[PDB]
């Protein structure tokens, strides 16, 4: 059967708390979001047909030829981490897919998977990424999706073997995947080269992204000048791609800056589709976006109205309304935008237990001084809270700038961002200043990631990095030179198939093998946890995390025909070893399950008891307060010789050594009231 | 005395809840806002020197001649109702005035007084608005203050005597008030004519505002054409003012629309300093502000970063950072902006008992549909929850456009927005659709304010209002045409002064006389409360609303030399009549005070007791169950005759007639247990 | 009136005083994965002696100085707090 595992899970959730940690103490709202009405006929024709009947170059040419603007929706990947800790299930997701696939045909592409997507899909949420992605392609055979990838490290935080990344990309493309993004935390050209090589090997639309940092309109800003970016862009275009892109992880683009940048790019490449990605944090994102989109841009990322603002992308509504009496002519019925926003607003309160609003009330400025990535801040606050330093979270970001100067002005998105975050964590944890930390950085132990970065497991930064600190930290450590990926010894995964199989594998797929190759520890942990309690993501989100409330009936599905009707009566109490019995209702049956409570620890220690099997052992005849001791440990004792006096209230008994010899040790402190029959001392 | 009154207030707060209504049940964080450091020197000279040295026309010319632009802070007026219910005390407010006076001298002006500032200062806050203003100028002798005033109603919601408005303006100008904004929700010209006449009577800078509603770039929008607004502005400037503003509560300024408007108006008036103000609700406001501030704007309204965006005005940080290398040349040290914003962020958590983040999560689209004004939405939700309709508060707004249609496309800011909201409230609580509500508008009792408006007390709209509905509602009520402000008989404020004095006044002031003149009821309530618990507005905000916690000491300053210490001991229990005894540490002594509890309801019921002196009254001899009643009320009874039978456990008792006489009432009734000495029968 | 029902609660967790260089305090809180050195053993300088684990980050303890350790307080597989006396270097 299968019901027993999930029933046990429900009972455990009732007895214990939610398995996943709770950042902020709250409860899900008692409101179900309203699903907008959907038609019946097949979804309209989008762009999957166009790329189907053409090549990536032909499709890109057709897109470029279009007069107007095409929009990117990141509400399925980026808004997650921007507004939450990316905890959204898939069960809630598979409720608007028919609507958008029918309603939205003009939309360019949708981003669902991303970097920090699988590291939670099994670690905190317990699901399979390939499974859910498989369940969406049939729902939307209309609009291409888009993968976010890093250059060297495929999904992980350290550069993976080149063959591994290649075969991973090949499998991902074989999954029916359409559009791919190539990116690197640094400007390490071999990293992007390897990424695009893997993308071309997979075969399909290839887009690379350039990070942005600092100012290009500021003459004082000189480390990353315009001509620096020009060289980067020209090198990448000589490498040859399909579509270019620009990243604004912090939302630092002023309108003048990006419009002059676009003028420069579109000047020398007046054929290439141009795409932008930004995070609206400073609050001026929409203005610059629209300005330097009217300038020369072609594609724009945008988040849903309810999932907008703060740090996420700007909204549907503002862009649609502004681009109305313009030649760009977005031309999208905003009523469907309205109902989409209403559904999302309804859905937000479900995960309201954790949110940036409780900490971050309104969009804060000074991000220029902080340069904290938008997709990182919520997870940073959560990890600080789980660390216990969530109280002094403001001081944490205060120390972040000093760590930036420790590593110098560098571009940080996924890996180095959290590297600086962890270094600042150490900084604030030790409560030490910047200068002397620079001074006595030799003996001071540093987190493993800092050592990895200093060794060079990622690549060379554009501007290099200080030597003396690296010598002070690495000291005697071997240091990686050249490309880490090429220097990395390629390894086979075929043996891992059989290892997984004969350990616990009887249906393991190559996707699962690759997942184990990525994160074997948490992979096996998720596998065993799922095997214990059966499959999840078949129930309501509040039902998943909060569980059913007492004395109510609810329904749960298993497949198309397997849908149940479940009610709960009450719970027993701790019977004899911290165990509970709870009583569920089937469609017509009554069930009783046992749950082992975890809140019963009951740690109690006692003075050693004298065991009667050992004749040498001496026990306390009467409980009471010890008056005096006549024999010290390791001293000779005569037969029937007084050694202790006991007196509780009325009776006084003097304990004598019943056998001749010497003692080993006395368990008496001369000043404790000790109960009878206790191992006061022993006789050889 | 004052100490006893405040101690009594604290005890009452401990026993009961907060006196003011609580929308959302929460508590402020136990953290104090960080006050940034201030220098020691006197504040510099900004524009107050110009105003005291030049005239309003000379000052306006000097402002206009400035190269660049000037900036507005609205955190002290507009942000209040934007994100709160304007419940901010002056206690926290008076802690940054020294900072800004020494730091910020480039601000064109500061807005502190507002339309919804006096009412809250009476009803839900117990302070004196004149008093609070009478310390603010003492802290800021550097920046002119600004105030938004309505024509027909000075601060109220109905027409007021012209004498009252003239006297109010004169008093305010005498107070030292600097900048005056004249505006009316309707474009009823005589209203603004009277307002500007009053402003000129006061003597000083006169500024007028024009609401922007609808689309000017839309050819379909015809009800208020560009030439409609052009004629409005033409006749305004024909009246003769100093500065013009464009009001946008809904925040619906397209960049193209506002830039073409500014260009068109500037061409015909290349002398007028331009003021602009809007509410960033849709999220695209800042784009339009940058565009048509580059075009021709001179003065720009901005809200602080911590209370920025969402539904409020845009932020300091975005404008300062974006316009750095620009001939507009903001020229503001952004370093102090950061601490200014962080103080507000810290203070925001203090008022966590009610905030839009509970309900309105992110800035929503569809504002073009509901067209609800910005700063009033929070109060709408609060009042709906007060009615209990805040549960289904969504249904309230979805019915608002229907009420607008009933009244036709009209301009609504303060009064008529309220009228449409009340109409929607009545509709939704009655469950009335469009055709259903309009079908029977005769028998249905419409709210009072609806009749007030349908009369035409405010004035005739631009295009009139439907006649069939007005006939079906007003029936045969008196109908007033023309300007009711002139039609209103002038009223004498002199005798009312003596009335309020010999009622409860002893040394009242003309400010208080006026305050009672507009609002006498709440003025009386405020005076009664102040005489009850003494002078308030010296408490910490959390102390004011929560009160002292037990086993905690703190310091409260009453006067400059009158500062003392308070600590809490404990609380007693209900002694006999819902009274509690609470003990306080003095600076070195102890005090005890009694508080009458309110949650103690005591009642008496059930059968009464037979009175001994009344021999005719017959009482139950034993406690037991009524079995049978021998005699029915109204029948003759003989001496020594059975009356009733009582049986409890084995005791059978038959009640004999004490006398010979007819029975009048059967107090014993039937089949209800009665104990001994209870009136069963009465004999006269 | 002094209550006799205090019942003070114990916590163990020895504290490494920073002024005592010999004492070693945990830079991070959390559970210990492995310890490379037994008590009373000779260790190098800048050498791996203990491994400390957190939720998603890892730090390896560095030898404070060149000497022989004296006592190991934490043995294996318990969660520690910030600056916990675990080892002493001599
Ligand atoms: C922990 O569950 C994984 C999310 C935290 C790491 C992610 S990875 C991509 C972002 N960049 C960063 O530094 N943290 C985020
Ligand atoms: C009731 O407490 C008074 C607050 C509501 C009135 C204010 S006045 C100005 C705004 N316009 C409106 O209709 N309500 C707001």
DSSP letters spanning A504-572: H-SS--HHHHHHHHH-HHHHHHHHHHHHHH---SSS-HHHHHT-PPSSEEEEEESSSS-EEEEEEEEE-
In B240-366, alpha helices (H): 255-268, 285-295, 316-322, 334-348
Contact indicator for B192, B411 with CB cutoff of 8 Å: no
Smallest Cα–Cα separation from B619: which of B608, B629, B630, B635? B608
Question: What's the CA gap between A98 and A136, in Å, rounded?
Answer: 10
How close B362 gets to chain A, by Cα (Å)? 6
Chain C hits for A448, CB-CB cut-off 8 Å, are: 57-60
Smallest Cα–Cα separation from A411: which of A420, A398, A402? A420
| Contact between A475 and C61 using a beta-carbon 8 Å cutoff | no
Residue A247, token pair as written in the block? 């990243």
What's the CA-to-centroid distance between A114 and ligand 1, angstroms? Answer: 11
Question: What's the CA gap between B641 and B655, in Å, rounded?
Answer: 8
Smallest Cα–Cα separation from B303: which of B363, B332, B344? B344
Question: What's the CA gap between B153 and B164, in Å, rounded?
Answer: 10
Q: Please give, one letter per residue, the 3-state secondary structure of A215-245.
A: CCCCCCCCCCCHHHHHHHHHHHHHHCCCECC
Q: CB-hemisphere CA count at 13 Å for A152?
A: 24
Closest CA to ligand 1's atom 11: A414
Contact indicator for B543, B552 with CB cutoff of 8 Å: no
The per-residue b/e assignment along A361-389, b for 16 or more CB within 10 angstroms, e otherwise, is: bbbbbbbeebbbbbbbbbbbbbbbbebeb
Closest CA to ligand 2's atom 10: B414
Cα dihedral across residues B136, B137, B143, B147: positive or negative? positive
Q: CB-hemisphere CA count at 13 Å for A436?
A: 4
Smallest Cα–Cα separation from B164: which of B127, B132, B190, B201? B201
Contact indicator for B122, B526 with CB cutoff of 8 Å: yes
Angle, CA A249 vertex, CA A246 and CA A397 arms, to 5°:
160
| Contact between A448 and C60 using a beta-carbon 8 Å cutoff | yes
- Percent helix, strand, coil in chain C, to 5, is 0, 40, 60
Phi, psi of B19, deg, nearest 5? -65, -45
DSSP code, position B442: S
- Nearest ligand atom owner, CA of B372: 2
Which of B313, B350, B362, B395 to substitute to test the interface with A, most A CBs within 10 Å?
Answer: B362
Q: CB-hemisphere CA count at 13 Å for C62?
A: 20
Helix, strand or coil, per DSSP, at residue B5: helix
Q: Which atom of ligand 1 is nearest to the CA of A379?
A: 5
Question: What's the CA gap between A292 and A287, in Å, rounded?
Answer: 9
How close A673 gets to chain C, by Cα (Å)? 17
Chain B hits for A363, CB-CB cut-off 8 Å, are: 305, 308-309, 315
Which of A382, A447, A449 to substitute to test the interface with C, most C CBs within 10 Å?
Answer: A447
Contact indicator for B308, B74 with CB cutoff of 8 Å: no
Widest distance between CA atoms in chain A: 112
Residue A18, token pair as written in the block? 């939610």
Smallest Cα–Cα separation from B149: which of B190, B187, B103, B114? B114
Check the annotation: does A609 bind a ligand. no
User: Rg of the Cα trace of chain A?
Assistant: 32
Contact indicator for C62, C87 with CB cutoff of 8 Å: no
Which of A288, A364, A392 to substitute to test the interface with B, most B CBs within 10 Å?
Answer: A364
Q: Which atom of ligand 2 is nearest to the CA of B421?
A: 13
Contact indicator for B295, B239 with CB cutoff of 8 Å: no
Question: What's the CA gap between A180 and A171, in Å, rounded?
Answer: 13
Question: What's the CA gap between B614 and A488, in Å, rounded?
Answer: 111
DSSP code, position A40: S
Helix, strand or coil, per DSSP, at residue B437: helix
Q: CB-hemisphere CA count at 13 Å for C82?
A: 10
| Contact between A317 and B254 using a beta-carbon 8 Å cutoff | no
Smallest Cα–Cα separation from A176: which of A121, A139, A207? A139
Q: Is the CB of A120 under 6 A from ligand 1?
A: yes
**Cross-sheet strand order for the sheet of C58-61:** C58-61, C50-53, C30-35, C79-80
What's the CA-to-centroid distance between A508 and ligand 1, angstroms? Answer: 27
Helix, strand or coil, per DSSP, at residue A157: coil
Q: Which atom of ligand 2 is nearest to the CA of B119?
A: 3
In A273-333, alpha helices (H): 285-295, 316-322
In this structure, the strands spanning A579-585 and A617-618 are unpaired
Contact indicator for B662, B625 with CB cutoff of 8 Å: no
Smallest Cα–Cα separation from B253: which of B293, B222, B307, B220? B293
Residue B271, token pair as written in the block? 């002398």
How close A385 gets to chain C, by Cα (Å)? 12
Contact indicator for B292, B259 with CB cutoff of 8 Å: yes
Partners of residue C67 on adjacent β-strands: C43
Question: What's the CA gap between A258 and B608, in Å, rounded?
Answer: 88
Contact indicator for B40, B100 with CB cutoff of 8 Å: no
Contact indicator for B206, B173 with CB cutoff of 8 Å: no
What's the CA-to-centroid distance between B413 and ligand 2, angstroms? Answer: 10
Residue B375, token pair as written in the block? 């700063």
State how far the alpha carbon of B483 is from the alpha carbons of A336, B184, B382, in Å: 46, 14, 34
Angle at which helix A189-202 crosses helix A162-174, to 10 degrees, equals 40
Phi, psi of A647, deg, nearest 5? -160, 115
Residue A125, token pair as written in the block? 């949420």
What's the CA-to-centroid distance between B482 and ligand 2, angstroms? Answer: 26
State how far the alpha carbon of B526 is from the alpha carbons of B97, B128, B250, B371, B542, in Å: 27, 9, 34, 35, 21
Q: Which residues contact A557 (CB under 8 A, 6 or more apart)?
A: A538, A563, A564
Widest distance between CA atoms in chain B: 114
How far from the centroid of its chain's Cα atoms is residue A549's Cα?
29
* A254, A361, A368 member nearest B357 (Cβ): A361
DSSP code, position B18: -
Q: Which residues contact A635 (CB under 8 A, 6 or more apart)?
A: A662, A663
DSSP code, position A456: T
- Other C-beta atoms within 10 Å of B487: how many? 11
Contact indicator for B337, B317 with CB cutoff of 8 Å: yes
User: Rg of the Cα trace of chain C?
Assistant: 15
| Contact between B364 and A348 using a beta-carbon 8 Å cutoff | no
Question: What's the CA gap between A181 and A585, in Å, rounded?
Answer: 49
DSSP code, position A116: G
Helix, strand or coil, per DSSP, at residue B159: coil
Chain C neighbours, 3+ Cβ pairs < 8 A: A
Angle at which helix A285-295 crosses helix B285-295, to 10 degrees, equals 60
Q: Is the CB of A116 under 6 A from ligand 1?
A: yes
Q: Is the CB of A204 under 6 A from ligand 1?
A: no
Contact indicator for A340, A357 with CB cutoff of 8 Å: no
Helix, strand or coil, per DSSP, at residue A187: coil
In A273-397, DSSP assigns E strands to: 275-278, 299-302
In this structure, the strands spanning B70-73 and A681-683 are unpaired
Question: What's the CA gap between A85 and A545, in Å, rounded?
Answer: 15
Q: Which long-range contacts (CB under 8 A, 24 or more apart) does A465-468 make?
A: A465/A407, A465/A408, A465/A410, A466/A408
Q: Is the CB of B414 under 6 A from ligand 2?
A: yes
Cα dihedral across residues A566, A567, A568, A569: positive or negative? negative
Check the annotation: does A150 bind a ligand. yes
Cα dihedral across residues B261, B264, B267, B268: positive or negative? negative
Closest CA to ligand 2's atom 8: B116
Which helix (H) or strand (E) covers residue A181, if one does? Answer: strand A179-182
Q: Which atom of ligand 1 is nearest to the CA of A413?
A: 11
Q: Which residues contact A506 (CB under 8 A, 6 or more apart)?
A: none
State how far the alpha carbon of B179 is from the alpha carbons of B113, B182, B200, B208, B585, in Å: 10, 10, 12, 11, 48
What's the CA-to-centroid distance between B624 and ligand 2, angstroms? Answer: 63
How far from the centroid of its chain's Cα atoms is residue B361's Cα?
22
Contact indicator for A447, A422 with CB cutoff of 8 Å: yes
Question: What's the CA gap between B207 and B204, in Å, rounded?
Answer: 10
* A282, A324, A326 member nearest B317 (Cβ): A282
Smallest Cα–Cα separation from A77: which of A313, A272, A247? A313
The residue numbers preceding gaps of C to N over 2.5 A in chain A are none
Contact indicator for A243, A273 with CB cutoff of 8 Å: yes
Question: What's the CA gap between A556 and A231, in Å, rounded?
Answer: 57
DSSP code, position A502: H
Smallest Cα–Cα separation from A244: which of A291, A211, A286, A201? A211
Smallest Cα–Cα separation from B579: which of B601, B591, B599, B594? B594
Question: What's the CA gap between A299 and A313, in Å, rounded?
Answer: 14
Angle, CA B491 vertex, CA B487 and CA B495 arms, to 5°:
170
Chain B hits for A283, CB-CB cut-off 8 Å, are: 286, 308-309, 314-315, 317-318
Contact indicator for A220, A193 with CB cutoff of 8 Å: no
Helix, strand or coil, per DSSP, at residue B169: helix
| Contact between A256 and B286 using a beta-carbon 8 Å cutoff | no
Which helix (H) or strand (E) covers residue A133, if one does? Answer: helix A129-137
Question: What's the CA gap between B157 and B376, in Å, rounded?
Answer: 14
For B597-653, give the DSSP string: -SS------SS----SS-SS-EE-SS-BEEEEESS-TTS---TT-EEEEEESSS-EE
- Other C-beta atoms within 10 Å of B386: how many? 11
Question: What's the CA gap between B164 and B624, in Å, rounded?
Answer: 74
Which of B283, B310, B339, B401 to substitute to test the interface with A, most A CBs within 10 Å?
Answer: B283
Q: CB-hemisphere CA count at 13 Å for B272?
A: 26
Smallest Cα–Cα separation from B6: which of B529, B542, B575, B526? B529
Chain B, nearest residue to A289 by Cα = B287
Q: Which atom of ligand 1 is nearest to the CA of A418?
A: 13
Check the annotation: does B385 bind a ligand. no
Angle at which helix B510-518 crosses helix B162-174, to 10 degrees, equals 140
Closest CA to ligand 1's atom 5: A379
DSSP code, position B296: T
Q: CB-hemisphere CA count at 13 Å for A27?
A: 6
Helix, strand or coil, per DSSP, at residue B455: helix
Phi, psi of A463, deg, nearest 5? -95, 10
Chain C hits for A605, CB-CB cut-off 8 Å, are: none
What's the CA-to-centroid distance between B381 and ligand 2, angstroms? Answer: 12
In the block, residue with structure tokens 């090198």: A235
What's the CA-to-centroid distance between A496 and ligand 1, angstroms? Answer: 27
Contact indicator for A150, A414 with CB cutoff of 8 Å: yes
Closest CA to ligand 1's atom 10: A414
Angle, CA B91 vertex, CA B88 and CA B97 arms, to 5°:
95
Question: What's the CA gap between B548 and B555, in Å, rounded?
Answer: 11
Phi, psi of A19, deg, nearest 5? -65, -45
Contact indicator for B538, B91 with CB cutoff of 8 Å: yes
Residue B677, token pair as written in the block? 């000495």
- Rounded to 10 degrees, the C-alpha dihedral A243/A285/A303/A203 comes to 10
Partners of residue C84 on adjacent β-strands: C15
Question: What's the CA gap between B678 and A627, in Å, rounded?
Answer: 71
Q: Which residues contact B421 (CB under 8 A, 6 or more apart)?
A: B376, B380, B396, B400, B403
DSSP code, position B351: G
Widest distance between CA atoms in chain C: 57
Angle at which helix A415-430 crosses helix A393-407, to 10 degrees, equals 120
Q: Where does residue C59 rank: exposed (0-12), middle (13-18), buried (19+ CB within 10 A)? A: buried
| Contact between A362 and B316 using a beta-carbon 8 Å cutoff | no
Chain A hits for C28, CB-CB cut-off 8 Å, are: 426, 429
Residue B483, token pair as written in the block? 């300007």
Helix, strand or coil, per DSSP, at residue B680: strand
For A412-436, give the DSSP string: -SSHHHHHHHHHHHHHHHHT--HHH
The phi-psi region of residue B98 (left if phi > 0; otherwise alpha if psi is between -120 and 50; otherwise beta) is: alpha
Q: Is the CB of A86 under 6 A from ligand 1?
A: no
- Other C-beta atoms within 10 Å of B218: how many? 12
Closest CA to ligand 1's atom 14: A376
Question: What's the CA gap between B389 and B380, in Å, rounded?
Answer: 10
Q: Where does residue C4 rank: exposed (0-12), middle (13-18), buried (19+ CB within 10 A)? A: exposed
Smallest Cα–Cα separation from B182: which of B174, A428, B201? B201
Closest CA to ligand 2's atom 12: B414
What's the CA-to-centroid distance between A418 and ligand 1, angstroms? Answer: 7
Q: Is the CB of C56 under 6 A from ligand 1?
A: yes
Question: What's the CA gap between A99 and A121, in Å, rounded?
Answer: 25
Contact indicator for B624, B653 with CB cutoff of 8 Å: yes
Q: Where does residue B463 rank: exposed (0-12), middle (13-18), buried (19+ CB within 10 A)? A: exposed
DSSP code, position A175: T
């Amino acid at each position: 059967n299968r019901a027993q595992k999930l029933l046990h899970y429900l009972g455990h959730v009732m007895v214990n708390g939610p398995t996943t940690p709770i950042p902020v103490k709250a409860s899900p709202s008692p409101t179900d979001p309203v699903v907008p009405a959907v038609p019946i006929g097949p979804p309209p024709a989008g762009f999957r047909d166009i790329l189907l009947r053409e090549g990536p170059e032909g499709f890109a040419r057709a897109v470029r030829n279009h007069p107007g603007l095409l929009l990117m929706d990141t509400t399925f990947r980026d808004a997650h981490q921007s507004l939450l800790a990316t905890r959204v299930r898939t069960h809630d997701l598979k409720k608007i897919a028919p609507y958008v696939a029918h309603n939205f045909s003009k939309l360019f592409s949708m981003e669902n998977w991303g970097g920090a997507t699988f590291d939670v899909a099994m670690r905190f949420l317990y699901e399979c990424p390939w499974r859910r992605l498989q369940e969406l392609r049939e729902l939307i055979p209309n609009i291409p999706f888009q993968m976010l990838l890093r250059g060297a490290n495929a999904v992980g935080y350290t550069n993976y073997p080149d063959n591994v990344v290649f075969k991973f990309c090949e499998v991902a493309k074989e999954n029916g995947m359409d559009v791919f993004r190539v990116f690197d935390s640094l400007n390490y050209l071999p990293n992007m080269l390897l990424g695009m090589e893997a993308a071309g090997s997979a075969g399909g639309v290839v887009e690379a992204a350039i990070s942005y940092t600092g100012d290009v309109a500021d003459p004082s800003r000189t480390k990353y000048s315009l001509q620096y970016y020009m060289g980067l862009a020209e090198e990448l275009v000589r490498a040859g791609t399909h579509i270019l892109c620009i990243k604004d992880m912090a939302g630092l683009l002023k309108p003048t800056a990006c419009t002059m940048l676009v003028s420069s790019l579109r000047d020398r490449f007046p054929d290439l589709p141009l795409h932008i990605h930004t995070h609206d944090t400073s609050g001026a994102g929409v203005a610059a976006m629209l300005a330097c989109a009217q300038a020369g841009a072609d594609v724009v990322d945008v988040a849903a109205d309810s999932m907008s603002g703060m740090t996420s992308q700007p909204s549907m509504g503002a862009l649609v309304a502004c681009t109305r009496g313009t030649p760009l002519d977005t031309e999208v019925p905003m009523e469907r935008v309205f109902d989409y926003s209403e559904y999302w607003e309804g859905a937000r309160g479900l995960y309201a237990a954790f949110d940036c609003t409780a900490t971050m009330k309104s969009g804060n400025s000074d991000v220029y001084e902080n340069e904290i990535p938008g997709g990182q801040y919520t997870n940073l606050h959560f990890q600080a809270h789980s660390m216990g330093l969530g109280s002094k979270f403001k001081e944490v970001k205060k120390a972040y700038v000093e760590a930036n100067q420790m590593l110098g002005d560098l571009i940080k998105v996924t890996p180095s961002s959290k590297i600086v975050g962890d270094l600042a964590q150490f900084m604030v944890q030790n409560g030490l200043s910047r200068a002397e930390a620079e001074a006595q950085a030799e003996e001071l132990s540093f987190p493993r990631s800092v050592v990895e970065f200093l060794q060079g497991y990622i690549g060379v930064p554009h501007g290099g990095f200080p030597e003396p600190f690296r010598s002070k930290v690495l000291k005697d450590l071997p240091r990686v030179e050249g490309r880490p990926g090429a220097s990395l010894p390629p390894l086979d995964l075929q043996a891992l198939e059989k290892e997984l199989v004969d350990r616990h594998g009887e249906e393991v797929t190559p996707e699962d093998v690759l997942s184990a190759a990525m994160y074997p520890d948490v992979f096996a942990h998720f596998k065993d946890f799922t095997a214990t309690f059966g499959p999840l993501d078949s129930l309501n989100t509040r039902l998943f995390l909060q569980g059913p409330k007492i004395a109510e009936e609810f329904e749960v599905e298993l497949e198309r025909g397997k849908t149940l009707h479940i009610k709960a009566l009450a719970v027993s109490d701790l019977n004899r070893a911290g165990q509970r019995q709870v009583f569920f209702e089937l469609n017509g049956q009554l069930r009783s399950i046992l749950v082992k409570d975890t809140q019963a620890m009951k740690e109690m220690h006692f003075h050693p008891k004298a065991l009667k099997d050992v004749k040498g052992q001496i026990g306390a005849p009467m409980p009471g307060k010890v008056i005096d001791i006549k024999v010290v440990a390791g001293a000779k004792v005569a037969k029937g010789q007084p050694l202790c006096v006991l007196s509780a209230m009325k009776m006084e008994t003097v304990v004598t050594s019943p056998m001749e010899g010497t003692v080993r040790k006395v368990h008496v402190t001369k000043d404790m009231t000790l109960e009878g029959d206790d191992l006061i001392l022993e006789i050889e």
